[PDB]
Every structure is written in structure tokens, then in C-alpha cells.
Design a binder for this molecule. Structure first.
Ligand SMILES: NC(=O)c1ccc[n+]([C@@H]2O[C@H](COP(=O)([O-])OP(=O)(O)OC[C@H]3O[C@@H](n4cnc5c(N)ncnc54)[C@H](OP(=O)(O)O)[C@@H]3O)[C@@H](O)[C@H]2O)c1
Ligand SMILES: NC(=O)c1ccc[n+]([C@@H]2O[C@H](COP(=O)([O-])OP(=O)(O)OC[C@H]3O[C@@H](n4cnc5c(N)ncnc54)[C@H](OP(=O)(O)O)[C@@H]3O)[C@@H](O)[C@H]2O)c1
Ligand SMILES: COc1cc(NCc2ccc3[nH+]c(N)nc(N)c3c2C)cc(OC)c1OC
Ligand SMILES: COc1cc(NCc2ccc3[nH+]c(N)nc(N)c3c2C)cc(OC)c1OC
Lengths: 246, 246
């Protein structure tokens, strides 16, 4: 009942985007994470040390394919997010697909307690969205006037983000091809709200020991079954997986 | 730089053991764990809910190949370990390889605070080892007389297990082909002591949310690079990976 996986194909620059195609229509929330073999999401507090050239390449590709990159403010601070960068060819590909040259960043915050000073606001070609609650949306909008488009993403509860609503507000703005890059709290909520369509997971060929948190945190205990759409690899033993919710 | 992995081979019952062969000589500490896509080691407190027929098959195979199955007492209690079971054919294969019919269980405990009552002691064809410290080995041996062979596994510090010493004591008893099945504390120590030779990791196609711990816990922060030896899959989207320390 077991099948050996082997490299059967070198992916061309044209085929790789195809493997990570978004659906033709409808919203699609894709997550891109990286974790060690022993499930650690961080090395020395952040994820980058696990990411080699292969993962950076995939990471940048998923950004290139996304209409919008949604990230928790925690990751934004910790990973030092600034504006999404797109190279000339990336911009060309994006135009060819009917997309803006650079995907927007969307920072998720229940508190809305974002400072005007952040690099997500400062070092950015594209002004970012701030996805927050109905309760704080107005004060946040005022505080962040000129810096970010503040969008209330509450459903029934004005004090919380409803993640389905969040996805919908993005789509409503024509940002239906969503990529989230974390963090584990945000991902946890997406998973709990059952709005995660796809998880692209780089499995870095490291064990990192017990300190690191997982790529999902929170009190949530779910068991969402996913289908393995693909596994890619590179010469360094990384697995670039793509799982789609069943 | 990216290669697509695909199933290229259906593994026969003869080839599968070959993929998980131990080295011809020397000690080899292999770990077998299972984790969800989001790095969770447990569902509802234990690992079994993530394990389908494929993982059980691999799990049983690794047991069949091992001279000894080393587990923390935590896992022993929580997963309700009793004696290793071997079917007739499993025993035959084991004999053919020069191995005893059933691998021993080795329970690791720094405290040595094991009760005579446990199923590891009671429902077992083979009496298990208790790998513990020099400091408690004697009282533990007395307490567990007739139930378990108690082995002191301290190196410099009589109050602790030295995991290299643990591996050595096993080999010393002709149990050089070691399988550890956990838990995360034990695995954490193996990883910290740098004695983990190989990690066989089932990646179950689930996200489980933030509650679960990882397959490694502890204060440890390492970055042990591993080489991806193989990835198998089944029809249900599980990845059966084998990584070998570089
Ligand atoms: N290995 C990987 O792939 C990966 C990927 C990303 C991040 N990381 C790492 O994980 C760490 C950060 O963890 P984190 O959990 O704090 O990241 P995070 O989820 O990005 O940040 C948490 C914050 O974002 C907001 N948030 C998240 N979900 C929300 C929701 N459903 N509704 C409203 N607000 C929401 C909240 O902000 P407010 O407090 O303002 O309400 C929350 O406090 C960093 O160390 C980073 O390196 C790893
Ligand atoms: N997903 C998976 O593949 C997988 C695999 C195994 C277990 N699990 C799960 O993980 C959980 C158990 O976690 P756990 O960390 O408590 O398991 P554990 O490592 O098996 O148990 C911990 C105990 O074993 C002893 N121990 C471990 N390492 C030691 C060392 N280097 N030296 C001396 N003693 C050592 C200690 O016993 P003393 O206190 O007596 O000193 C320690 O308290 C369960 O929920 C189980 O389901 C999951
Ligand atoms: C400044 O913005 C950036 C932030 C980060 N943060 C760390 C980082 C690294 C690898 C990653 N790899 C995957 N698979 N998924 C992630 N979620 C991820 C993250 C979160 C990494 C960047 O380069 C890869 C980057 O530049 C665009
Ligand atoms: C009674 O002993 C047993 C204990 C367990 N415990 C849970 C369990 C399940 C799947 C697993 N799968 C892998 N890849 N690695 C593990 N470490 C593992 C464990 C730890 C599972 C058993 O059946 C699979 C079993 O019977 C032999």
C-alpha cells in the first residue's frame, strides 16, 4: 500500500506557477509556512533560518501569485515585514495574469493597536490593508489615515474578526487569491474558522529541538483533513508540500 | 531548482524493510514519530488518531526491524504501552535477520519512579528494560525485580541519563538497532545529545490546531541538519519520511 516518491520532473519556471495556481474563480486562502522536521516554526525567534534558496524561491513565487498577502501583526513585527517586493519579471507575470504589479499586504489585528511607524506602512510601494474588528475599525482608520486602508472584518461580533468575513472583504476588494504567511495565531484562527483552503508547507530538513512553537498556535483542537496535492523537493532535502482542504 | 516528487514505485513487502534497513554494524538510533501538517504530535492527548493503516503498517515494520524499542515513561503511560507484539511472519523475519522473535521495550526514566503494575511489565512476552540513572538504578532494580532489567545509563552525572550512554548500554546488550517511539521529551533529549541518527516521520494529512505539542519538547534549541533519505506515500496522502542525520 506504500509508494516510493522520487523526483520525476525538473520544474521549469513556467510549470512551477502552474503547480501553485489559484482556482479560476472564487476566494482561495492559501497559507505558506515553513517548519522543521520536528514541527518547529521558528529558529531563534523567526522562520528565516530554516529557509534556504529553495524555500525563498517558492515563498516569492507564492507572493507573486497572490492578490494579497495576509499576515498577523505579530509576524509583521517579528519578521520585520515591509512592503512586498516584486522584480520586473514578477510584475510582468502579474500584469499578464490581470493582477496589480505588487500584491498588497493585509495586516490582521483584533486590537487595531498598530503604530503609524511600522515598515509595513513605511517601506512599501503598495499601501497595505489593515483587517480588524468593527469595534476598532474607525479609530484605527483615523490613527492610520494615509498609511493603510482599514477594513472591518467582523461577522456577528463587532469585537472580533470573523475570518470568513476577512476572506470575503479581501475578495470584495478583488483580492480573492489570498496568501497568508502567518503567523501561528492567525493560521490557528483560519484553521478554527475552517477557512484555510490550502496549506503550502516547506518542511525544512532540520530538527530544532523543543523550544520552537508550531506553525499553528492557539487553544484550538481540530482535525481538518487535507489532500496532498504535491510534494516538491530540491537538492537540499527540503520538501515543498501543498495540501488542499478536503 | 525544484523537482516534482511522484509515486514511482509500489513497494513490495520485501522492499519496504530494505528502505528502513539499519546499518550493518554499529548502533543506530532511529526515531519513529507522526505529526500533523501543522506539527502537532497529538490528537486528543495521544498520537493514534492521526495514524491510519499506512502509518500502523510502517510503525509495525520499524518495530519488526528494531532490536529494541525505547520509549519515555510518559509515552508508555499515555499511549498505554504493553509488550511488543510480533506476528508469526514478523517473528520469522526477525529470526532470519538473527534477531529475537520480539524486540524488547526499554523505558527511559530519570526518576526511576515506575510502578510494578504497568502494562509494559504485565502484558508482555519479553521483559522490558528500564533505562535510568546511576543514582536510582539500584532502588529501581529492587522495586522492579522480576519485572524489568534495570540499566543505569548515566555518564558523568549519576543523577541523569546520558543519552549516548543509553544508546551504548543498549548496544552493549546486543540491541544496537534502536527504535525510539517517543515521546517528545525523550526525543528532545536524543536531539540535544546529538545521538539521533534517523527520524522516521509520518506526516499525517491533517491540521490539528494549536493545542497539540510538537513531536519534540524541551528547552532545547538546536539546528541539526538532516538528509531526506526517502519519502513514501499511500493513497490517503500520508508522507512516510525518513531523514538521516548529516
Ligand atoms: N515557520 C513559519 O512558517 C512562520 C510563519 C509566520 C510566522 N512565524 C513565526 O511565528 C511568530 C509570531 O507568532 P504570532 O502568533 O504572534 O503571529 P501572528 O499570528 O502573525 O500575530 C498575532 C497577532 O495578529 C493578530 N491576529 C492573528 N489572528 C487574528 C485574528 N483571527 N483576528 C484578529 N487578529 C488576529 C493579533 O493582533 P492583535 O494583538 O493586534 O489583536 C494577534 O495578536 C514569529 O516568531 C514568527 O517568526 C513562523
Ligand atoms: N506524535 C508522535 O509520534 C508521538 C510519539 C510519542 C509520544 N507522543 C505523545 O507525547 C506525549 C508524551 O510526552 P512526554 O514528553 O511526556 O513523553 P516521554 O518523553 O515518553 O515521557 C517523559 C518522561 O520519560 C522520561 N524521559 C524522557 N527522556 C528522558 C531522558 N533523556 N532521561 C531520563 N528520562 C527521560 C522521564 O521520566 P521520569 O519523569 O520518570 O524521569 C520523563 O518524565 C503523549 O501525549 C504521547 O501521545 C506522540
Ligand atoms: C520581509 O518579508 C519577509 C519575511 C520573511 N519572514 C520569514 C519566513 C521565511 C520563510 C518562510 N517560508 C515559508 N515557506 N513560509 C513562511 N511563512 C516563511 C516566513 C514567514 C521572509 C522573507 O523572505 C523569504 C521576507 O521577504 C519577502
Ligand atoms: C500499544 O503500543 C502502541 C502505541 C501506539 N501509540 C501511538 C502512536 C501511533 C502512531 C505512531 N506513528 C508513528 N509514525 N510514530 C509513533 N511514534 C506513533 C505512536 C506513538 C500505537 C500503536 O499502534 C500503532 C501501538 O501498538 C503497537
Amino acid at each position: 500500500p506504500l509508494r516510493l516518491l522520487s523526483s520525476v520532473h525538473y520544474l521549469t519556471d513556467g510549470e512551477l506557477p502552474q503547480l501553485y495556481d489559484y482556482p479560476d474563480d472564487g476566494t482561495w486562502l492559501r497559507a505558506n509556512f515553513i517548519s522543521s522536521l520536528d514541527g518547529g516554526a521558528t529558529v531563534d525567534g523567526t522562520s528565516g533560518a530554516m529557509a534556504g534558496p529553495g524555500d525563498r524561491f517558492v515563498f516569492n513565487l507564492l507572493r507573486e501569485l497572490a492578490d494579497v498577502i495576509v499576515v498577523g501583526v505579530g509576524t509583521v513585527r517579528i519578521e520585520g515585514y515591509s512592503g512586498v517586493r516584486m522584480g520586473v519579471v514578477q510584475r510582468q507575470h502579474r500584469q499578464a495574469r490581470g493582477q496589480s504589479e505588487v500584491p498588497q499586504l493585509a495586516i490582521v489585528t483584533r486590537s487595531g493597536r498598530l503604530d503609524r511607524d511600522m515598515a509595513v506602512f513605511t517601506r512599501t510601494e503598495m499601501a497595505p490593508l489593515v483587517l480588524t474588528t468593527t469595534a476598532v475599525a474607525d479609530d484605527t482608520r483615523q490613527r492610520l489615515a494615509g498609511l493603510a486602508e482599514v477594513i472591518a472584518c467582523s461577522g456577528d461580533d463587532p469585537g472580533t474578526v470573523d475570518e470568513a468575513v476577512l476572506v470575503s472583504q479581501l475578495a470584495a476588494r478583488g483580492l480573492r487569491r489570498i496568501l497568508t504567511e502567518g503567523g501561528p495565531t492567525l493560521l490557528g484562527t483560519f484553521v478554527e474558522r475552517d477557512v484555510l483552503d490550502e496549506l503550502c508547507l516547506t518542511i525544512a530538513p532540520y530538527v530544532v529541538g523543543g523550544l520552537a512553537r508550531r506553525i499553528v498556535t492557539g487553544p484550538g483542537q481540530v482535525l481538518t483533513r487535507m489532500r496532498c496535492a504535491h510534494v516538491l523537493t530540491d537538492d537540499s532535502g527540503y520538501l515543498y508540500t501543498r495540501y488542499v482542504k478536503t
